[PDB]
Amino acid sequence: AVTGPKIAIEAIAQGKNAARVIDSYLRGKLEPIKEPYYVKQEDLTPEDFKDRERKPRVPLKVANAEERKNNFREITSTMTEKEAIAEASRCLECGCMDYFECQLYKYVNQYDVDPQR
């Protein structure tokens, strides 16, 4: 109703942010949504990951076109537990392991830093 036709996760994000702002407003302290500052690595290129073992992605089971075009049954299937664990084990763990306890992140989010200069 506000952004026009988008994907559903954008609508969910809008609903969650609006819920946050409405909860603040119901307390008399209407606060806009503040975007946190995150340290990122924009310089990473494929040769930085050239030593990792290559592992295949979990295959997606798709129903046969001839049979599926005649019915309204689900086209794709949910993966199995073995495939789920094997696929989750492929993650490279890009995020910082200290994110939930790092004091530097907390302090740089308490003070409006402009570190690009």
Partner 1 sequence: NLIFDVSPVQSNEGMLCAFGRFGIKYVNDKDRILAPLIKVNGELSKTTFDQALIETAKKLQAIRASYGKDSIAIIASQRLTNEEALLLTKLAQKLDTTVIGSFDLRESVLDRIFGLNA
Binding status of residue 67 toward partner 1 by CB under 8 A: yes
> Which parts of 68-97 interact with ligand SF4 (CB under 6 A)?
91-95
Compute the distance between CA of residue 34 and CA of residue 112 in angstroms, rounded to an integer.
11
Considering the complex, state which of residue 7 and residue 94 has its C-beta at the smaller distance from ligand SF4. 94
- The contact pattern for partner 1, residues 2-41, with x = CB under 8 A and - = no contact, is ----------------------------------------
Query: For residues 40-49, b (16+ Cβ closer than 10 Å) or e, as one string?
Result: eeeeeeeeee
Binding status of residue 69 toward partner 1 by CB under 8 A: no
Compute the distance between CA of residue 103 and CA of residue 111 in angstroms, rounded to an integer.
12
The two structure tokens encoding residue 117: 């200069």
76: left (phi over 0), alpha (psi -120 to 50) or beta: beta
From partner 1, ligand SF4, none, interface partner of 91 (C-beta below 5 to 8 A by class): ligand SF4
How does DSSP classify residue 71? Answer: S
- The contact pattern for ligand SF4, residues 33-72, with x = CB under 6 A and - = no contact, is ----------------------------------------
Please give the residue ranges that form the binding site for partner 1 (CB under 8 A).
67, 71-73
